[PDB]
């Protein structure tokens with residue numbers, strides 16, 4: 001059933017599972033028309049499909065052409081998400097297919113369930129966690145590949161870089177969700193923290209800076225401070 | 238007009254015949270029900286005074302045989318049986334009528350209620366939902382489960398209603414996932430009407446039979462089936478005009494007949510609000526919406 005604080009270690013066991021976040025699939029700018037009405041203009045989006053054990057990210061880029069001539073786009077976006085996740089599973093070898101798919105928003109449950117009806121043994125689950133995966137478009141290299149796409153495209157990443165060589169999946173996921181939570185609460189401050197010291201760089205094949213273990217502790221501390229703060233700045237405490 | 242005689246009434250019991258009912262006391266001379274209208278199915282049903290658990294009863298059609306009721310003290314219930322000797326039967330009935338211990342099926346001349354509740358219900362279809370082919374009549378009770386309920390446990394004693402499941406391979410075509418889930422017209426018209434039921438009359442007959450078993454026996458799986466068959470029509474954008482008009486009449490009489498104090502357990506808030514206010518057919522059930530709003534505005 002639902003995924004929450006009490007069954008958190010299940011993410012890092014040896015049953016293949018994927019998180020699916022659809023927040024960034026349908027993205028628009030809202031603007032005024034010459035007549036003074038309001039209109040939207042879509043921009044490229046993405047499905048964020050993540051193996052939390054291995055860090056493998058299946059980033060399906062959603063090009064704006066997929067919305068052309070369609071109605072009720074926020075509803076269509078959930079069904080397009082489920083179509084694409086469905087197609088991804090069907091493309092994987094049997095032994096790589098997930099045993100569970102956890103959706104970050106409950107409105108994805110019925111679309112994904114209907115699309116996966118022939119995979120009766122793959123469990124589709126909601127979660128009670130408020131995960132910060134919407135902030136994935138605050139990672140510069142992910143944002144860059146989404147905005148540059150001129151056609152539908154799947155791009156594969158490891159969102160943990162090489163961290164699993166030094167730390168466990170549990171710790172890597174905790175670091176990821178802390179980074180994304182910070183980027184979501186105050187993007188400018190978070191990004192300042194990550195790049196302030198010009199001597200720490202991002203490898204061409206990585207998403208995040210090449211911090212030593214000691215520097216990650218400092219970094220992680222600064223992100224926690226930011227989040228508690230913003231929570232003061234927000235609520236005044 | 239036909240007659241269902243009773244050998245005796247050895248235990249105190251409330252007896253129903255269609256939408257009517259009366260109390261019989263322990264060992265009170267009672268000899269049956271006369272003047273039963275020919276042309277309709279009927280249900281005769283029972284609730285013992287000592288154990289309101291288990292309402293049970295029998296669906297029958299007097300054109301198909303001579304039927305009577307006899308209490309069985311071993312199994313502890315009133316049993317329907319068929320009498321094959323026609324002269325023995327006429328003779329039993331005529332004597333009981335001459336002695337005046339039979340309740341007269343109490344139909345008011347103006348009253349079309351029972352017709353309206355059973356318009357499309359046929360005995361031959363009842364006997365396929367309720368499988369017991371050595372009898373011409375069909376036993377139903379409060380506890381019997383449906384085929385679909387058993388899939389989610391005794392098969393001989395099941396209600397074999399047509400399985401309807403909106404998140405199923407039968408309901409959803411490869412490539413039309415969103416289309417078929419949000420508009421069930423494919424599933425209604427091609428899969429169910431053309432494929433399984435063959436026509437809307439058989440669909441309505443099963444819908445009406447499910448309602449009546451829910452109402453008379455408190456049969457929960459029958460209530461589920463009734464609501465599913467309503468929801469499959471209301472969630473279809475494309476329904477023949479004649480079916481929508483007939484559905485409105487069907488439901489109108491079902492809602493009119495429902496005991497006012499059973500609406501809390503026999504009516505599903507979600508289905509009714511979706512059907513009357515959100516669905517494709519939200520504007521096609523004028524009579525049903527008007528009675529629901531005046532009789533059960535709390536539900537909505």
Ligand SMILES: CCSc1nnc(CC)n1N
Pocket residue numbers: 266267268337338339340
């Ligand atoms: C409900 C049983 S029918 C019946 N019971 N006693 C009499 C005599 C008045 N009668 N006709």
Ligand SMILES: CCSc1nnc(CC)n1N
Pocket residue numbers: 086114115116117118405406409410411412414
């Ligand atoms: C409605 C059951 S789901 C389903 N059935 N066939 C396929 C292959 C496209 N699929 N996704």
